[PDB]
Design a protein around this motif. Sequence first.
Motif, short mmCIF file in Angstrom:
data_model
loop_
_atom_site.label_atom_id
_atom_site.label_comp_id
_atom_site.label_asym_id
_atom_site.label_seq_id
_atom_site.Cartn_x
_atom_site.Cartn_y
_atom_site.Cartn_z
N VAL A 111 30.64 37.68 33.12
CA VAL A 111 31.76 38.42 32.56
C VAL A 111 32.99 38.27 33.45
O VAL A 111 34.12 38.22 32.95
N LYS B 292 33.61 35.52 35.10
CA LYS B 292 34.03 34.17 34.73
C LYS B 292 35.04 34.20 33.59
O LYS B 292 36.17 33.72 33.71
N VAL B 293 34.62 34.78 32.46
CA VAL B 293 35.41 34.72 31.24
C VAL B 293 36.68 35.54 31.36
O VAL B 293 37.71 35.21 30.76
N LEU B 294 36.64 36.63 32.14
CA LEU B 294 37.83 37.47 32.30
C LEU B 294 38.97 36.68 32.94
O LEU B 294 40.13 36.84 32.56
N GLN C 29 30.59 29.50 30.74
CA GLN C 29 30.54 30.47 31.82
C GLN C 29 29.21 31.21 31.84
O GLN C 29 28.79 31.71 32.89
N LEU D 217 37.13 41.38 26.10
CA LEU D 217 37.97 41.40 27.30
C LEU D 217 39.43 41.12 26.98
O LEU D 217 40.32 41.57 27.71
#
Lengths: 89, 77
Positions: A9, A11-13, B3, B42
């Motif tokens: 999480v 990573k993607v943020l 990821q 996000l």
Amino acid sequence: RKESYAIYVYKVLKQVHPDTGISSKAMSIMNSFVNDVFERIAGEASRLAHYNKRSTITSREIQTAVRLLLPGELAKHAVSEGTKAVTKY
Amino acid sequence: GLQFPVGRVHRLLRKGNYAERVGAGAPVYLAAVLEYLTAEILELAGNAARDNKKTRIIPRHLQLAVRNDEELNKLLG
């Protein structure tokens, strides 16, 4: 919850918002969303496999469970993300 | 370039006792689906953060972003 996805999480943020952080209390909430969806997608894919007398959870069984459980264009873009993903080796 | 690691998602599927064996593309498909849903959350949560000048996503921006996005609300209600 059960499994931690915090680094993934993280990573993607940085891909979505490289200069916006996430709290530790919110990261726990993010980790709960992933753990819940993981067991729902994998749980329905196993029901789909067990039903058709299948001994293999493939990408089509995952794709079906994604279509049945994610509503609206959530499933539309997720299936696009999945089919594009396995299209590399 | 995911990821989410295809490796662990494959191991999480094997130890999960969902079926006998797991296809090679199944953890790839699931990792991308898992990565897409978090990127969706996000982003809206990160939007609501800096829409409040906040430089950090807090549980409120997660609650607001999923709740009034009724697709995410019907999924994670």
